[model samples]
Target: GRLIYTAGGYFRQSLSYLEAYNPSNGSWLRLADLQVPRSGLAGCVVGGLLYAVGGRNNSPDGNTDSSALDCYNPMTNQWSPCASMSVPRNRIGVGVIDGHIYAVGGSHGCIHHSSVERYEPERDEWHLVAPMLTRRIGVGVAVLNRLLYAVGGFDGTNRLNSAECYYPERNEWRMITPMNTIRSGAGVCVLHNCIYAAGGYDGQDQLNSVERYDVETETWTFVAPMRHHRSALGITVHQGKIYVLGGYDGHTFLDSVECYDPDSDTWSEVTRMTSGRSGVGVAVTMEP
Candidate 1:
């Protein structure tokens, strides 16, 4: 069976906590902690190795942003350091295409609205790529038809409904139709032949809304809303279902977990984590 894993996130502080979920049994197993405690990092799996990208770490002095990259090996149950990024940031978005992981826009002290780059594991390096049209922080990224689509996020000054994509072949970025509502830290994933963008903050209020993209039609439409109004949540697709986990609900951080079934086009609260988390990293691995 496949497993869903959640890594470090913020509650009271940046966390090093890691846990794995087995959908078949609905059980959770504590895994190895991240080498560095952090939140707002992006998680992606490459060749069975889980990778965590740039994020911010808390320090007494003030903001200490990280360009740090780490990889977790399930077989070893350990997290190892990798080459760091050139530009440190948090609340970044990531996606894998052509065996390389792309790091999209994020914020350090302020938004790196247009920063974009990809990690080349063999070379142990990050190479800059075409930046997005708009600068973004807390962006949502997903791979569809081999293209990386960056969805809603906050630009330095405002919540954004803007969306765009990158094509490595041409080393270029192009715009996609924006979502219906502004979203920052929306959970995004590819499921059932479509791209789904779910709950995020809309400047003033936490959101419960969801929207789906019809790639062929190149349009976005509303889907069923989520059970909780949250942002900076962890979202991923496994075994034909979409799972969303703990995030901030405006007043409090959440520990709840929910699942969406495309066949039923419905959402249901399924489980809860041991603690509340916001901006956690979620990834799926083909493991027992």
Candidate 2:
């Protein structure tokens, strides 16, 4: 069984949710609502628990912002406050590995940061780790072979394809093979031991190019491109399938959704989201 959960919309927006989808035989179950509406928030599921990290409740046009971290448990259908982050941030990427959560590069107003932080669920506290080589925002993060990998994102001036990995035990970062293309706000999800990076704009153009990062060889290989060129998208793997959700096409925000099957090496359109958005978050829930 697969369950999909999505954020409300942009910033300071009303939260919306559903319970059924015919395209994938999956349901959009409404879990506990967020305390405040947020956007550019990063989400990840580990050991059947969901975490929403630092994000802004309102857009920069508004006066105030946040650096809050909220934790949600689907089993209880409830949300509770967690320890706040050291530095307030928004539009970041998150990854989970070796039973710890890693929050990567994000921006605060005019400041772009490269710092990394680890959240300890048991201790209910966050520990600062080594910072990244380059400060960036809107990144794609995933864990493979016990290493947390951070992909393309935008620094203050431009988009980047530089890739880096953090060894939790060693607490060090090593820059690895970069993506074939430079992009920010793409879809990143792992399947069958390979990490798939799909659909994001390359500063001047929106892209549909798809690439896979091989953990064993530490290299990237081309794969089937997505049908649409988009950025600021949401990606998740459910039942061995990679789903690419709504994002901006440069000209406009989209509600379209697409899925890629690695076994068949093909991509097919899925049901579109009811609301169009770019900086949204998505997570899949499945019982063990």
Candidate 3:
């Protein structure tokens, strides 16, 4: 069974975990909480190691900046200090490829970013990687077949649909076919070899359109639209389904959750999360 972990953003910053859902029993058990109170952070798990990446400090005055990169071992239930990133950004995307953790585009203050970095946990070192083709923040990143794909985000002046892929082997970036509509702050993940891009805000409007990218052909095709148009949402692939969690719906925040079955080509609503959130990390616990 695949247990899921997510960062909770409502009330204050916290982290939540769902062991698994039983149709007969409509409830979830909280696993553990994060050490810091922060949102807009990215999470990634590799070799059963969980990482909490760059996130913004909660403050309206924007005086707080978070550069902390915390690492967690599921067996110990404790977090240890890891290599810090070169920059401080919130709402960024984090992923692991070839055993190295890559932290992609994010923002600090009001400015967006194209700056990206990678961390080697064993050596406790951070290395600057190739920058993305486009500058953006609040983007979703997913790793499929060794390439890191960066999805929707804003370029400071405009929201973007420009998607690109980063090759870890070459440390180079290449542009791919972009989304049909421009958007930012979406959740992206890979399920069954297909890249799922869901829930983001187009410059003019929010969207529920779900798009899929075929790595074999290097083409993007449409998928079932999400139940709602949400930005700053969280997404992860568990078992064979794609789980879409809490996010903002333009005017208001949300606590709703949904899952999509690719085999059935349909979406089924899941139990609502404990708190409404956006830009939280998503990872699997226990490593299958």
* Candidate with maximal lDDT: 1
- Give lDDT for model 2: 0.77
lDDT tens digits, residue span 140-200, model 2? 8888878888889899998998888888788899999999999788888788778878987
Residue-level lDDT of model 1, residues 1-288, one tens digit each, is: 389999889987888888988888888889888878889988889989898888887745566777999999898898899998878879999999988999999988864658898999989999999899999889999998899999989888888998998988999999988898999999999986688999999999999999998888889999889999999999998899999999999888999999999888899987888889998889998652
Across 32-64, the per-residue lDDT of candidate 3 in tens digits comes to 566665677887787787777887767454435
Rank by lDDT (best first): 1, 2, 3
Q: Single out the weakest 10-residue window by summed lDDT for candidate 3.
A: 15-24
User: What's the C-alpha lDDT at position 161 in model 3?
Assistant: 78
After superposing candidate 1, which stretches have Cα over 4 Å from the reference?
A: 59-62
Residue runs of model 3 more than 4 Å from their true location after superposition: 8-27, 60-63
After TM-score superposition, the amount by which residue 12's alpha carbon in candidate 1 deviates from its true location, in angstroms, is 0.8
Model 2 scores a TM of 0.91
